[model samples]
Target: AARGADFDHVYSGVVNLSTENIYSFNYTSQPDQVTAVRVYVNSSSENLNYPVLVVVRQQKEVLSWQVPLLFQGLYQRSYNYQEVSRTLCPSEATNETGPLQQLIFVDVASMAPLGAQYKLLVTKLKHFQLRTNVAFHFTASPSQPQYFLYKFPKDVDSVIIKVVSEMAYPCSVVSVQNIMCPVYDLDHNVEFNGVYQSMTKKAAITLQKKDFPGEQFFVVFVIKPEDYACGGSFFIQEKENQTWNLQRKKNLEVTIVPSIKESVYVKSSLFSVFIFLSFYLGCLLVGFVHYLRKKYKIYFWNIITIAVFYALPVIQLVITYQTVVNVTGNQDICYYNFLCAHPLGVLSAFNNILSNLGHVLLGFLFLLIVLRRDILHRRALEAKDIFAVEYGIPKHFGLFYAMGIALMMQGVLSACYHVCPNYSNFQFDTSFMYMIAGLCMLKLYQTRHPDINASAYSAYASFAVVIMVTVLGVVFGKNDVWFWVIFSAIHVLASLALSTQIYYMGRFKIDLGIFRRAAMVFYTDCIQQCSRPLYMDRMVLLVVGNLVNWSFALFGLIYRPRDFASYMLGIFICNLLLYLAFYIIMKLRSSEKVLPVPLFCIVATAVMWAAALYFFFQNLSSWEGTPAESREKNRECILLDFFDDHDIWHFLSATALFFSFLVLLTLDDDLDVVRRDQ
Candidate 1:
């Protein structure tokens, strides 16, 4: 055996490798060890170029290229020469009837060629026994590859593979059986077991005992052909009996302490789920009992709607939680706020899901308050029939009931989203939020113009269209000129139609005839100054509507955002706020005095909104970004070590929505005990 400067063994010579004649070489390798091989093939004649086929097989195997072939290569990197590089390990070659000397046959053949010049190099990789807190360093390049092996002992509950690299571009692949090196710019399917490639320079891959491929595994440092070299040091920590507290660092390495964990509750997630379920089921039981006993139907459909939406996701998540955890191996399949990911019971992030309980509890409280007011109104009407003739705005609770149900559904859907947070399921949580805002606006409109209010079917249909448009926006909103154009047209048309209807008190229709009539009227009024311009009383609202909608259209056309959800949310929230402001201003301008309760609700609403907005702006995991980028926003639990900032957002936002809905529901109470004609 001839030794090489960079390899343990080298073989170089000229050989006739053609279609008719196949050239082969044999070498004995250790039966239990892994060996790396690199083969270079070149044409002997300077003017000739040929493509070569290389195959490797163990000795004493079938000569046919069917089953015994260890590897086959047909490299297409160059016109005159090609290189094939790979690692051979015993675990990958499963032949029980093998001889003591494990021989590797390097067979080479060309499509059509003369004599070819070839060089083959072989090297043995070292295996290291892994112990707790032991670190290993490795350096690899295109010309030289490194493979490190470790045979894990049994009873390992969890193992964290932490790698710190010299540069952020280099990566490492960890495999169980064969050394499956990752290629650059290739989208790999996760079908192979225990195969993981690092996307970032510093990566921490946590592996559970159940997901481990076997007792043994291999870690290989790989670089792309264009990359010069990759260097990294990694350590494996067994987390079964240790508690690790990770601290942030400016440099590559983060600090970790291996101390005993303080005593903490392990059933927090189960307890959290229990809390939500109890509220839903207990309230359902009590509500039904009360309805049956008193022959009074309160929040009937509202309860049913909220219950259905809540139960469906609860059932779906309970059924699929373990399956998801197993299939994804607890990786990026669920975006947990890792910094505050409180691992209790089966949940990886219990606190994030727990925070959504705010919506459920507060929504129920709002429902109870509405129920109380409704009962009081009925009792008052029964005692004195003049109550109906003399007092109150039209007591319509349909919109209030819908809003309350939507608020509760927000919690259910948001919790469901947190269970498996990803881009695909984000819509579930946000859809009901849009419902709440639209319902509130509808309620506000119905208070003053009950005769001209939109029907349930029309209002729900509008909401469905808005939601469908939002879906389209999320998919095709980013830098899509066609989508922007279509969206702008729809927004402007919808706004104009709605403004016309509101101004005309549902008398106007939006057909081609209406447009012609409108143009003629505008010409007759503005151009000729006919009759002081019709409908001047409503021109303020129309002008404001057009201004706001046109500004939205122009902004959307110019600075098209990549995050369509955030953009649309900003638009929706801002529109609701401005509408609320306009309502208050119009009421005060009309010399209407606000009741004390309504006034207090307005103040509470404003304060709660401010606090909620502050928490909402806190950076959380973004589904639009890559998992690595999302991980940067992960934060520690801030409240009772059971919830994070996003959870606080849930609490505050839910409270704010409750108060805002209260303002809408009770704002016209001042008309109570007054004559209808007055």
Candidate 2:
């Protein structure tokens, strides 16, 4: 049983392999190549019924050349229909005696009569080690997938593979451990830790070596079978000093190819936002000058508060825009609605940014209307004959002015958001929106029950907490069950406490002591049937509050929406509308007939809100998923090839907000000629 079959000591050769034939190649590793060795069997004919297979074997006994299959490597048709490659380190040959002679077996075990032809290449190298920083060019065909292996040094924490396709065709890059042949398929699942980059000419895949089971990893690139031969150059770079030093440096130096169409869209978009921003600034200047000329008139001090708050979001917009454009890398930086994205120069979503001007224009116009009303109230006060000072709702323009400014802040923050729209900063667009809704509700309450209305400090502090909670929920509520549970409870409890305050005419506090006292009273009165329930006159209001808030809480807890911030904002807006309806009912119950102006404002607000909400629900874009996934929502511009559905939402919503504010402003105007004690 001595070694009988002929073995060729060929390092590389071409052979036609069939099911009836098995070819063996012999190779001996030298000291210089003790690090690693590999065998490659490439074939252009992809006959799935009779694919190729390669195995490694060594001498088992003196008279027998057969070795156990324990140390053998196998190759077959993979998800990719390319060459079959396998790495064979001679360390597995330690069981064999004397000088090592490794055997490479290439066979096809199929029943088909005709077999595949393959080019055999067996080589010994330094652990298949790829040199760091050395550029390697690769050509990936539909039938041939590229493969390379690299070992990271112990001190190196990460490696980055910078791949750029010369032809700008899509290619898939994968990195895996202990595997020489990495398969990548879109229709089937292939486990790899890299990206199938498309639409861009270049991509970087980072492998944190610390995450791998060993210091060494294999890289693979494959082009789709339908695509032409794609060529690319790549290099592996170690993290400098095992930190982000070099990577961050390279990131800052990236250059974007000029786009003939999208570049203009970005520039035009940015220019539109700037135009509105400057226009708002100019109007503010005139208003400031007017304020200085008549300091005490028109309650100018309250309007100044709006200017201060509006400046905050403006400054925030400047910082965010600068940071996105320069500090952070810009490749797929923001989720822009590409369909409506009229990129002019630098801005990507031009139409979305321009549409925000609606808020600024309507906001300033609303401020002017408030100012004129303030002046008319002042004249009526001075005349003393038209109406008594204490007869009508106190002409407190403070909240109205704040609402106007909140509207302007909405535009500024929203534009800032459209600058780089994504989940991380989505709250930027919604920050002042909560304030707008809250302010409107507060104004409605103040009109009828001014003395019992919540103080500005307390109300604003509550709004701040709401915003902070919304931020936390958006970040954590998606996957954290406990976050949803806790937030839901707090929302319900807060609503109940606020309802108590409203029912008790501002005397009911949220203190534990107050709770205990109220519990004792309930036990002694309603529970014991000793007397009628407390606050009987406000029972309906309290019940409605509990019902509405509890339903919202239950919905949040049960469904746990991914976009919790948006959901909560929706709740706030609805609550405000409900409160407005309650206020209208109370006014009607008081036998106060609605004046023509107030009636028109109410009807117009409802109609505009209907249209605005219809536009709002249109799916324009999302930040809940990856940038590529979000891009699936992009649709062509529906309006003038300039704006999308979301831009229409901005305009319609702005108009609706103005009309709602008008309702709050003039709802009590009919009381001007009435008596003080009527």
lDDT on C-alpha atoms for all candidate structures: 0.56, 0.58
| lDDT tens readout by residue for model 2, 1-678 | 122224323333222333234556566644323334444555554555544444444343111111100111123212333344444433322334444566555443333355445555555543244667766654443233344566676566555555554333333333243432233322122233343332223444435555566466555444342212123222122223532111101110111121224444566567546645564576478667978994333334443454466446555654576365432333345667644565434665557778888798778878887888778777887888446475766667777877887788788778877876766677776667788898887776666556654443676676668877887777766749888888878888777666666543445256666555445433455454534654343556666867988998898788777877678777887788777777787677776778986898899889988888888878766777654344445665766557788888887788789889989988887785555522
TM-score of 1: 0.64
- The 10 consecutive residues of candidate 2 with the worst lDDT sum are 64-73
Candidate 1 lDDT (Cα, whole model)?
0.56
Residue range 1-678, candidate 1, lDDT tens digits = 312134455565544543322334344444444444433332332323343445655443322121111111124232111333455444333345343344455555544446555555555444333444566665443223334555455544545555555444333333232333331211132225454433334444444445445555555444333211122222121112322221111123221112112233445445555655664575468667978993224445644554475448554863475356545443555655655655445666556667788788778777876777778777877888675646667677766766777788888878777776767666665566777887787776777667665453566666667767887788766568889888888778766666556543444344655555445534555574556654454556666867887898889889876666656666676667667766776677665779986898899889988887788777767666555445546655676556677887887778788889888887877775565422
Q: Model 2's lDDT to the true fold?
A: 0.58
All candidates: TM-score: 0.64, 0.59
RMSD of 2: 16.0
